[PDB]
């Protein structure tokens, strides 16, 4: 009980130093702190050198005293994995935070492991149809690949990642894991409640028929919990890939917050900071996590990760390092969103490795490359169109600006998760309707239609449905004077009879503020503790 039970030696925010009198814990070991108000586990990060470990708190450290007993659990953070974890919400250390009882577990896996080996990789590319036009055309997603959605605070990468949950994750037929890393807790409650009414999560005795397990380390957590909750989301996804042997969908909302939480911690671990202010170990910290999120020869993980870009800077080293770890990068722009185009996907900055004529076919590939060619040549014109206007263009170039304004609107589409605030019902567009629709605008079959008919429509059947409506409206606009339901006697009572049908409510006048409240009698003096711990008034000197 004396050795292998260390004591807290110093506390600097999220970073605790524990001194062990003998047998130091290994690096990445979990350490419980005895006598804290909540369960405080500490993950050993460094051996400092004088029988001291430096460790990271997975909860708050306000309350730690410099003698507090710390027991070593002899192993890393081990979280419940299995089919019993489906339909549950876990935090970083595997505790259920959904009040549904304890998580019955097939196994309790540590959240730290190595990547699958090079002999364990699987090199197969089949497409993942998402129903999104700009995605399925220009940067198509791979069915076992890594997908990144790059965004700059309000451009739409949570709406896009909830749309992929809506489109892909129901027709997938496998298990999903949603690791929420450092995002809003309101959004964790929204997804959890909307999965219960979708039947993706089933509560009670039918819990085993759930298809999704949630791991949440949201933005109220201390930076140790947000730095490790992506790792316990993968461990749940890796059990379904390795042991259960099946196809998983991992959705990681803001994998940037993993990098940012290690950057809050790294200042206090005594490290010289790297470029912009990040950890010196940014690429290997992120690399060690991302290399675990792969498709192996035993199972598949289709991983969609939102990547926040800070201050809209794509050259920031946390977005810039992530780009190499992904098979498909969907870059969402702020200027595209200010033109009202949603999803705000930059068509000339989003990239897939699936855009290859031997993978998606030459008809799909030539449309995507032709769409990108007129959008690029239009971008080359925008300096002149701003200054000189379109009147100074060649009419060869005016056909570019006319077509590229049309496909820019046609890349946008309504979402079935955005209908609750936009009003417009959402359109799943099939891949064959995407390819044929943009091929028509490139050949010139739809230069008749105005450029606003292409805006927020499903496929090329519906731009003709919307252009007909636009033409029809410009004719019929008014002549609704009377002989409608607004007659002052048919459907309508007296106005003063409606006053009396109001149920008048009673108003209580007293504000209800001192019904249960108990007031601490605060003293007229600052109450302090003397050398023997006694509650003493503040003595009188300086």
């Amino acid at each position: 009980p004396a050795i292998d039970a260390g004591y807290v030696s110093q506390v600097i925010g999220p970073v605790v130093d524990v001194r062990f009198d003998g047998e130091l814990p290994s690096i990445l070991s979990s350490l419980e702190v005895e006598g804290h108000s909540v369960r405080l586990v500490l993950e050993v990060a460094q051996h400092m050198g004088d029988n001291t470990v430096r460790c990271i708190a997975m909860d708050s450290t306000d309350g730690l005293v410099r003698g507090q007993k710390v027991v070593d659990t002899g192993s890393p953070i081990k979280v419940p994995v299995g089919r019993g974890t489906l339909g549950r919400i876990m935090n970083v250390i595997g505790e259920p935070v959904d009040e549904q009882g304890p998580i019955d577990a097939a196994d309790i896996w540590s959240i730290h492991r190595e990547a699958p080996e090079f002999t364990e990789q699987s090199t197969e590319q089949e497409i993942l149809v998402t129903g999104i036009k700009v995605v399925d055309l220009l940067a198509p997603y791979q069915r076992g690949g890594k997908i990144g959605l790059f965004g700059g605070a309000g451009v739409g990468k949570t709406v896009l990642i909830m749309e992929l949950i809506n489109n892909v994750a129901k027709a997938h037929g496998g298990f999903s894991v949603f690791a929420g890393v450092g995002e809003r807790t309101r959004e964790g409650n929204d997804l959890y409640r909307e999965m219960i009414e979708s039947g993706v999560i089933k509560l009670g005795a039918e819990r085993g028929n759930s298809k999704c397990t949630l791991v949440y380390g949201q933005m109220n957590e201390p930076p140790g919990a947000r730095a490790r909750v992506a790792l316990t989301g993968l461990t749940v996804a890796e059990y379904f890939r390795d042991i259960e042997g099946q196809d998983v969908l991992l959705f990681v909302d803001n994998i940037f917050r993993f990098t940012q939480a290690n950057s809050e911690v790294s200042a206090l671990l005594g490290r010289i900071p790297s470029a912009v202010g990040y950890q010196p170990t940014l690429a290997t910290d992120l690399g060690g996590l991302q290399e675990r999120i792969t498709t192996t020869t035993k199972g598949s993980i289709t991983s969609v990760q939102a990547v926040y870009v800070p201050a809209d800077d794509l050259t920031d080293p946390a977005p810039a390092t992530t780009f190499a770890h992904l098979d498909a990068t969907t870059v969402l722009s702020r200027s595209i969103a200010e033109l009202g185009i949603y999803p705000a996907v930059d068509p000339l900055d989003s990239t897939s490795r699936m855009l290859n004529p031997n993978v998606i076919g030459a008809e799909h590939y030539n449309v995507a490359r032709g769409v990108q060619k007129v959008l690029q040549d239009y971008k080359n014109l925008q300096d002149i169109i701003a200054i000189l206007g379109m009147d100074e263009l060649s009419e060869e170039d005016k056909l570019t600006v006319a077509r590229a304004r049309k496909i820019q609107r046609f890349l946008s589409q309504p979402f079935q998760v955005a209908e609750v605030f936009t009003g417009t019902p959402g359109k799943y567009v099939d891949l064959a309707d995407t390819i044929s629709g943009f091929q028509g605008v490139l050949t010139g079959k739809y230069d008749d239609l105005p450029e606003m008919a292409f805006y927020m429509v499903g496929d090329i059947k519906e731009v003709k449905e919307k252009a007909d409506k636009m033409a029809k409206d410009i004719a019929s606009r008014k002549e609704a004077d009377n002989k409608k339901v607004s007659e002052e006697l048919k459907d309508i009572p007296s106005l003063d009879k409606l006053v009396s049908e109001i149920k008048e409510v009673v108003i209580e006048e007293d504000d209800g503020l001192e019904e249960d409240f108990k007031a601490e009698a605060l003293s007229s003096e600052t109450v302090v503790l003397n050398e023997e711990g006694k509650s003493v008034p503040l003595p009188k000197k300086n």
């Binding site: 306000d62 919400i89 807790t185 959890y192 109220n220 200010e338 605030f421 106005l495």
Partner: protein, 523 residues
């Protein structure tokens, strides 16, 4: 020099005691002649080793908790940030010029507290809960921690109820739900406070008309402001009667940077009294961009490595752990709520700055206040194309939701048509309907300060504008046509629209009838 060689020096290895026995009889006489030169030793108390930059290094304090109130013998509070092996670094809640090297540091035994309760309502307190309005101590109150963790996923529910701002552009286009945090972001001098003050004045008008459980108790946190601005604001709340429901937490520009850093957590803890007891709070953090500058000062004076714009790495966690406490609680937790309005000042309209984009990633919507619309007299200068409220939409007034769908759309066309041709190339008759209706609705939405409008007078005024009833007036007397509308219609039509919530078809053509017998000033 390893510890294997140093822990051999535990066991005695001298075998010759001719100097141990000698000085053991002369040491206590030696110390006794130097006792007026010894400060008394310190183990559970503290003694200040170094003070400067607003950080004290305190020897001793063997059993301080991390992050608890310590009290200097000068009477100043501190907070034990880092407990080190040899000292404790405390951050001084006040002026560090009154702390000396050698001063006693006393332990209060509690993590940092503010008085919360019903008796903090009405008062002007500082960043630590000590009242500065001069009218006594806080009574009918109890202490609560300022660093509570936000409620989790299962302790929350969806945002259902509307928080009426009384601002016409806000409650129509960017409507605020009742557990929702909403950023007010704009340049200097753009009406950012005026939107937050009109919300606080408006809740006073509604608390005498709701049955005690739907009462909003506002809290205004002023970080980094001038003390004359705060005193002019307390006078405005006192003369409108809004201080009966308002707490005013003030850490001004002359206060210490740890007081300005702590003041939004102090005020959030006072507003979390109403969230936790089933009531409803409204917290305003005026210049949360000034609270990050105060925290950047403390982090650079603690010699922590700066990142982008020299802000620390955890300046996101500074604001995210704060604004996450603005929640709508579930019904087993009382159903209470707290809605936040952070204010971020923007430099030259640049929304892609560091602290601005941090709070956009935290909050649920924005109210962008454009400098260019504010110079044209369109006040509140609400950038309609950029201001969002997605949590508060489908939680708004059902009558306003009927008429503002056309209002947002006719403004959506108005921005799109004005994007094409503002200078007179050629004017269509269809697009000059849009510029005639768009300038109608823009003059409709601009309202003047410190007079928030009820939501039933606000639905009717937009009903009179998205429909006909105002196309006669050009653009100029539309402000005078509104009180021509809202005073000349029968005041019973505001009572049925309030009590039903929406425009029934019985009230629909009644209100068409009252809007045809109002006399419009443009004739």
């Amino acid at each position: 020099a390893d510890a294997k060689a140093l822990d051999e020096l535990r066991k005695p290895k001298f075998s010759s005691k001719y100097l141990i026995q000698h000085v053991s009889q002369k040491l206590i006489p030696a110390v006794k002649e130097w006792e007026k030169s010894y400060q008394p030793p310190v183990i559970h108390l503290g003694r200040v080793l170094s003070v400067g930059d607003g950080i004290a290094r305190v020897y001793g304090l063997k059993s301080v908790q991390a992050g608890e109130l310590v009290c200097f013998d000068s009477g100043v509070k501190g907070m034990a940030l880092n407990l080190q092996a040899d000292h404790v670094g405390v951050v001084v809640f006040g002026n560090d010029s009154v702390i000396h090297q050698g001063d006693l540091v006393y332990r209060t035994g509690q993590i940092v507290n503010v008085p919360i309760g019903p008796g903090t309502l009405g008062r002007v307190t500082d960043g630590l809960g000590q009242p500065i309005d001069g009218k006594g101590p806080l009574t009918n109150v109890r202490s609560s921690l300022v660093e509570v963790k936000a409620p989790g996923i299962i302790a929350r529910q969806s945002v259902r109820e509307p928080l009426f701002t009384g601002v016409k552009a806000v409650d129509a286009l960017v409507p605020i739900g009742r557990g929702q945090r909403e950023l007010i972001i704009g340049d200097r001098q753009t009406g950012k406070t005026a939107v937050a003050i009109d919300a606080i004045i408006h809740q006073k008008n509604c608390n005498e008309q709701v049955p005690k459980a739907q009462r909003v108790y506002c809290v205004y946190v002023a970080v980094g402001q001038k003390r004359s601005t705060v005193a002019q604001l307390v006078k405005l709340f006192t003369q409108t009667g809004a201080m009966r429901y308002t707490i005013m937490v003030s850490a001004t520009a002359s206060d210490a940077a740890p007081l300005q850093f702590l003041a939004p957590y102090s005020g959030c803890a006072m507003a979390e009294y109403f969230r936790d007891t089933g009531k409803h709070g409204l917290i305003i953090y005026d210049d949360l961009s000034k609270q990050s500058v105060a925290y950047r000062q403390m982090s650079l004076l603690l010699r922590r490595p700066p990142g982008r714009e020299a802000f620390p790495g955890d300046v996101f966690y500074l604001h995210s752990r704060l604004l996450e406490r603005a929640a709508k609680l579930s019904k087993e937790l009382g159903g209470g709520s707290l809605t936040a309005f952070p204010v971020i000042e923007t430099q030259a309209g640049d929304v892609s700055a560091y602290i601005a984009t941090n709070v956009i990633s935290i909050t649920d919507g924005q109210i962008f206040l454009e400098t260019e619309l504010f110079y044209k007299g369109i006040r509140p200068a609400l950038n309609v194309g950029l201001s969002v409220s997605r949590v508060g939409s489908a939680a708004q007034f059902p009558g306003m939701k009927q008429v503002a769908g056309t209002l947002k759309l006719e403004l959506a066309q108005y921005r799109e048509v004005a994007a094409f041709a503002q200078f007179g190339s050629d004017l269509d008759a269809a697009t000059q309907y849009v510029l005639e209706r768009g300038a109608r609705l823009t003059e409709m939405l601009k309202q003047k300060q410190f007079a928030p409008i009820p939501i039933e007078r606000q639905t009717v005024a937009v009903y009179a504008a998205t429909k006909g009833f105002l196309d006669k007036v050009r653009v100029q007397d539309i402000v005078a046509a509104e009180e021509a509308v809202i005073s000349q219609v029968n005041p019973a039509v505001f009572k049925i629209l309030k009590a039903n919530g929406k425009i029934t078809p019985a009230l629909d053509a009644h209100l068409k009838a009252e809007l045809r017998k109002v006399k419009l000033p443009g004739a």
